[PDB]
Design a protein around this ligand. Structure first.
Ligand SMILES: Nc1ncnc2c([C@@H]3O[C@H](CO)[C@@H](O)[C@H]3O)n[nH]c12
Ligand SMILES: Nc1ncnc2c([C@@H]3O[C@H](CO)[C@@H](O)[C@H]3O)n[nH]c12
Ligand SMILES: Nc1ncnc2c([C@@H]3O[C@H](CO)[C@@H](O)[C@H]3O)n[nH]c12
Ligand SMILES: Nc1ncnc2c([C@@H]3O[C@H](CO)[C@@H](O)[C@H]3O)n[nH]c12
Ligand SMILES: Nc1ncnc2c([C@@H]3O[C@H](CO)[C@@H](O)[C@H]3O)n[nH]c12
Ligand SMILES: Nc1ncnc2c([C@@H]3O[C@H](CO)[C@@H](O)[C@H]3O)n[nH]c12
Lengths: 224, 233, 233, 233, 233, 233
């Protein structure tokens, strides 16, 4: 076990969905999985294992911020042998190319964190997902009739930003939304030779100021 | 209200104890507070309001890491008018001068985060607590008989460090332990003109190599909890 | 009629193949492009327009290094109205998952350059290609039987590196090879709302030191050239 | 015997007051010490030993700027076995919470220097004083009826700043004044396991534009001096 | 022999004139050299050897940008035994001290590149030419009657800058013009213990927006070419 | 008139010799200057005005480190209208090209300071002297038979370095010795459009550990002193 997860070794399936909110994790388990079982609950951060169309899938909460997400993903990969990690979170849109409830696939995750400079020789790590997973998401979305928005996200250490004047420039450079974990998810899976992908649903639009079941079904179907 | 707290304005007393683990927040509520009332629970991050020896105090969980801690502390100060914030967390020791279950008062919080450079002109912000709260901690601990170790902590973005070779250097510069929130709590309270202090109890020793169970991280630290409650009385 | 291109507006088709070496650009025009016409030649950096399976395609040399690549790509987009930019080049392998003659599709381009920090608020810009273009490359490679390797590249300001001790760490973080332009092409295309993708053929293995002979170098690369022309038509 | 101090080993008491200005060091020796003795004079940077109310105490100049301070402090600790170093300097106020001639105790020293990143892994070192000395100063100030302001200072490489637009942000983050050595004093004493503290009296008010004269910066701060001598007794 | 130069070892003279544009290299070979042989042409990047008024000298193109220039200079020094490198080229004026057609000798080259921090301990490398070459340029221009402006240049990674708002500041600090290679040339010559100098001629004024005609760009730089060739004699 | 200089306006000649040690400044006034007159003494930092071979010449102490040197140089130029600043001093050699008693002319000054990044858009400022002054020194040294060594120096914030393992790399990049002010003097003179040059005499070798005796130090420094005074005539 670990300081942060109290599941037995082997309780996690090799494919795992991730959200920051452990209550969204619990919602998915109850609504979409058969024979769901809570397997961890340290710090109220819940994880579950269960079945979707007969196939095992795990769920795990990772909290908020790159440092929190990195703890849980590192342990899922190294201790619990998880191979495929699909984050399904929320984000604040900053681009006119997306609207409320749109699903974004993050093909790159920029950041204001120092974590990847520490990891990567003080240079610029382009934090990216596994390509096969990104291709799988695109094809799965197509057969579900979901319109996938695709681009970069900006993973910030700040929910309440001190650089809101720079949102336009981020959007100019194909950043569709801001969240707070993807660059850490991506860098950790790169570090540990695992397959990761971030999808986020737009819950706020930061420019225009304006029930993610479709993203959940997308994630479950691409793990089938 | 706020995106991460569903208490209404006025639910928090202006003095608030803080832990990363909302279950520790839950444990302190049930055991030490009379008429404890759960006042927030978004994302399972629990907060409480209750009285301690007749004086009202609040409790709030802040999650793990500077980014998580900053969200909750910002919201407590700006929206819930919390005035004094006392973090009582855990940490990993990197100094021979401390052992398991020792209490550390962080008079400075160094960091490998970029957050304070972003806040502070790309310069070095020396993240520090409110001196009056630190003096209270020292005096209260003296009165209670608690041996308070005082020094810097290092607030890291990494629980699993890529720089374990640097631990002796950190300890040479008076860093007693590593945790992951103090520099953010301190900078946020500095930004927002509030009073903050970080106390942390040693749950791991990174040199003599020990570690405490997740249960033990809630249960073996009543000394630090009582010290915090007494400071706020 | 930019400082570095003397074509007229309208001489470039909206899809353009890019190489650092203008002589390779010339090779492609003479071997593959019907009705190939030279349209620019400032600094001996040649560009061409022609047709491949009935579709208009342009070709342009960009020289070596992010700064050189950035000049040409900026001018192609902002003056000559190029919308899709497909770069093919060579690279030096640093990963045990790729070998000589492999074709790599760069789904991200890390860098030791300061250019993207200058462009992007002194933060970390994750320099990435257009997804629909990468989709086309994968689908076309499968169709042509090419076993496309997919991962990051590291775009360096140094051909002769001062950090060869870091190659294993780059390879651990899914960098398959080093070249010197992709981070620049990707960031310029992101800035200017254009669709770009980089493919590179492994001519040299920086770890084992194996290297293609000149005849091998042109034996392969022809496949990469066909891939690029096929995905653009 | 160092390049910068020509005292003999054993001339310094373990407790030493420090000023940047050696003529203030001279002023203190002549006015407040019995049996005072000039023990060093290299580069006109004077130091003295003598008694204050029967008790031995040393005084030493450290010049202006972190690099100068670090030289003298390093030598006082490593060569002359000084254990307690109390700086009593001057500063320029940037916060409305203080005025001319107020005394400030620096519970942290932010900086625009690169020295602490060089010392400390290119991370953020929170340069802080020894807590027991800081406790000593608060208690003695109270005991003497001296009003003592407490907060951070910002130690800059610049007397003539290029970032005066940033002073309000500094003041917002609890920086009461700007001086040029405390960060280096603090980090050197952390490096070398010594006890250090910085007090500074406001000699310039950067928001209203007052500036005392050179004569005045030596003679107008007797309360800070008496405070320092008292906490060393 | 080298990946980017296909001359035989010994084909270059120890003194080599450098220019970014290989067609300008060819122009110099035609108008100023006798018995000139083109000795290298990889990537259309021409180099020559021949006689300037009876004295053997070489010419070599280096492309655009620090990374491109560093490749060619490194190969000239380490493989082809070049000892004195004189670089000429154009620049964009940012100071009121220079105007169109002025020749600038760069006694320092500042930069927005990360390359010298990678080279030099992440500190500030002051990239400078060989002094004897600068003195020889100064005496040769005086003798030839050529007015030589002397100061710093700024070597940018960006031909199309994102920091045009900063040009006045660069000019205040004695940056007369912007180009894209000198900082790399100087750092490379310093690494490899070779002598190097950069002259540049103002073809464009980035402030007043004046520019030379197409004819003038062909014909106005002969005085700089002659100065270079003469100081190699 | 300034917080650090109590000279009357007009007390300084427009040509000023600088040295960090005010007692060395006094020594120069006392031995070489006709009608030498003390004009400032704030903080025991002496300065003088007088005549050498009939021409008026000022001397000024600037203390140790970039921050201190910047204070005095800024005030000399801005308040006292000093136009030409000739800095002498000592240095610690790190290159095998120089030995004890050698006089070094610094045509560039690298640094580990953050000052020039703060000054210069967070980019790399190449700190360089005025070229005319460098020629004057070379020509005067020639006339006087002095074998003047020319290259870069490294201006460090640290007398007691934490990076001694890097000295060989510094010397590789043509850094002949280490001192602590030149990068600041140069940047300040660039900022304020003044003419400055740094000369330093090798008193110690940090590689071979040779050192000049306390006596033989003063006879080696008269040569550099006379070089400086002869340049200002
Ligand atoms: N402006 C923003 N708007 C909506 N959601 C987010 C988020 C995401 O939601 C969480 C913050 O509520 C956090 O984990 C992050 O992934 N970050 N920033 C946001
Ligand atoms: N060796 C250790 N290293 C880093 N952080 C912690 C902590 C603290 O406990 C949590 C991480 O387990 C988080 O709240 C952090 O601040 N305890 N032990 C730690
Ligand atoms: N070790 C290496 N091996 C093969 N090719 C390259 C390249 C590519 O080839 C060019 C340098 O020869 C340049 O344009 C870059 O894209 N960089 N580094 C390389
Ligand atoms: N407005 C001001 N700004 C910066 N430093 C100082 C100082 C201090 O006084 C000296 C500079 O005058 C030096 O010791 C510095 O720490 N006094 N007033 C200052
Ligand atoms: N604004 C500018 N104006 C004129 N020349 C240049 C240059 C020089 O000309 C080349 C770009 O055209 C480049 O390699 C450099 O040598 N850079 N920036 C310039
Ligand atoms: N290793 C070293 N050796 C000799 N001199 C110096 C110096 C020079 O001498 C002073 C240090 O005593 C300082 O101000 C600088 O000018 N810095 N570092 C030195």
């Amino acid at each position: 076990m670990t300081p942060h997860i109290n599941a037995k070794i082997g309780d996690f399936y090799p494919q795992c969905l991730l959200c920051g909110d452990p209550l969204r994790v619990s919602y998915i388990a109850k609504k979409f999985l058969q024979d769901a079982k809570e397997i961890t609950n340290v710090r109220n951060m819940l994880g579950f294992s269960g079945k979707y169309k007969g196939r095992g899938i795990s769920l795990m909460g990772h909290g908020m911020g790159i440092a929190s997400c990195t703890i849980y993903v590192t342990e899922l990969i190294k201790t619990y042998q998880v191979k495929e990690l699909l984050r399904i979170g929320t984000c604040g849109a900053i681009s006119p190319k997306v609207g409320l409830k749109d699903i974004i696939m993050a093909t790159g995750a920029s950041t204001d964190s120092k974590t990847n400079r520490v990891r990567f020789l003080n240079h610029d790590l382009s934090a990216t997902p596994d390509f096969e997973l990104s291709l799988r998401a695109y094809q799965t979305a197509k057969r579900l009739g979901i319109d996938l928005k695709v681009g970069n996200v900006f993973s910030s250490d700040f929910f309440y930003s001190f650089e809101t004047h720079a949102f336009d420039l981020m959007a100019k450079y194909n950043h569709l939304a801001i969240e707070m974990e993807a660059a850490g998810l991506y860098a950790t899976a790169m570090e540990l030779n695992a397959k990761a992908l971030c999808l986020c649903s737009v819950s706020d639009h930061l420019i225009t100021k304006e029930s993610f079941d479709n993203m959940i079904i997308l994630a479950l179907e691409m793990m089938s």
